[PDB]
């Protein structure tokens with residue numbers, strides 16, 4: 001695995017011990033061979049789990065999720081997928097890692113896709129080795145992979161709204177259930193209906209995941225209601241998964257706006273990861289997977305692959321060369337390598353709009369490529385009437401940095417900035433000049 005020019009896909013089934021057994025073996029071999037190594041965790045939660053699995057090995061934890069300060073002598077770095085891509089974009093030295101390990105390497109957030117592109121390009125160039133750890137490599141067609149224990153798979157209608165009757169199987173269960181919903185708003189309605197029926201519910205989404213995930217250990221619960229973020233190595237003591245088999249797809253229309261299309265079917269990889277939350281204990285056979293729809297390859301034309309190209313066009317590789325997407329996922333977007341390469345000052349703007357601005361990649365790119373500076377928020381207010389953002393069926397309003405009340409009407413509309421109350425609150429704060 002550890003030889004230059006090799007990319008290994010460690011595609012053991014879910015719970016086969018890729019993180020807890022195989023990763024520490026790889027790290028011990030890497031240190032023996034003096035390979036400068038990076039380990040990429042999808043989340044802070046997984047970063048903390050890795051520290052436990054690697055405890056006592058010389059690993060630098062480039063994350064505040066782990067309260068160990070680096071001794072200085074480590075040649076193994078551990079950071080999140082997003083942190084890797086972020087450091088590549090910033091005017092900060094990232095070492096030439098000889099060995100690049102990505103855990104949960106199926107993660108389809110733009111920074112993860114970009115990280116795979118950069119790493120796989122380095123391996124193709126003969127510069128490095130890589131290991132991508134995932135039960136579900138890109139374009140897997142198998143939603144029902146092997147498990148540590150037999151799973152009971154049932155195709156069943158799954159509610160996506162509050163229900164009064166017709167779904168007794170949902171609440172008649174005594175065990176713990178992980179329920180995958182297509183969106184935060186959809187989870188909120190299901191969570192409220194379960195709470196009304198006397199159930200204890202924890203909700204997880206990207207913005208809440210570190211804080212809320214701790215509740216699954218610290219409090220008793222009957223249901224976890226989660227978006228797709230729990231596909232990225234989130235482990236639960238559960239005996240049932242309920243899977244809507246639905247997700248939202250960000251889609252760029254006419255190069256000019258992003259909508260959240262769907263809900264629509266998940267990929268086979270997503271379905272397999274959702275199911276793979278259960279069947280993990282060889283001593284507890286007959287965990288249940290209830291699924292409410294089919295799969296489809298809805299990553300085709302999904303904005304995250306175009307966003308990954310926008311990141312990779314803006315990462316230095318060598319002279320004017322630009323990293324390609326990892327070959328198995330490179331057809332998910334129709335893009336020209338280099339089309340989104342920005343001049344130095346616009347690139348800096350692009351980076352800050354993502355890092356400090358917390359804007360989606362696509363929207364950051366529109367603003368930076370227009371020659372707008374990071375603090376210039378006029379574009380938040382000067383869009384067409386149909387770009388008006390609504391809050392409880394009235395236009396959303398903010399006080400501008402000038403102290404004027406204005407309707408929020410961005411020049412470029414990206415539905416992710418108002419997908420839920422928390423998103424819209426953040427975007428209002430941005431439009432107001434508050435970060």
Ligand SMILES: CC(=O)Nc1ccccc1CC(=O)O
Nearest residue numbers: 060061062063064068069070
């Ligand atoms: C603070 C620490 O002990 N390790 C480390 C080393 C190098 C760069 C950044 C970090 C921390 C971080 O990225 O949060």
